[PDB]
């Protein structure tokens, strides 16, 4: 259960854009600074910038 501190604007279809306060279910966070998050609001996959999210 992570939270995107800032709004992220996905630049490709392989990532999901979130907003400040949007909850994102982290998935894979062992590759680099970007992890695969799953939006629970609609239910879609989309990488995410770890520098914009934080562990709550």
């Amino acid at each position: 259960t992570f939270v995107a501190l800032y709004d992220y604007e996905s630049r490709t279809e392989t990532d999901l854009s979130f907003k400040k306060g949007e909850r994102l279910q982290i998935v894979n966070n062992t590759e680099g600074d970007w992890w695969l998050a799953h939006s629970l609001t609609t239910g879609q996959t989309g990488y995410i910038p770890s520098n914009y999210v934080a562990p709550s």
Partner: peptide, 12 residues
């Protein structure tokens, strides 16, 4: 907020 970082690794 910081500048968008490099996606994990550079393509290959």
């Amino acid at each position: 907020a910081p500048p968008l970082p490099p996606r994990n690794r550079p393509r290959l």
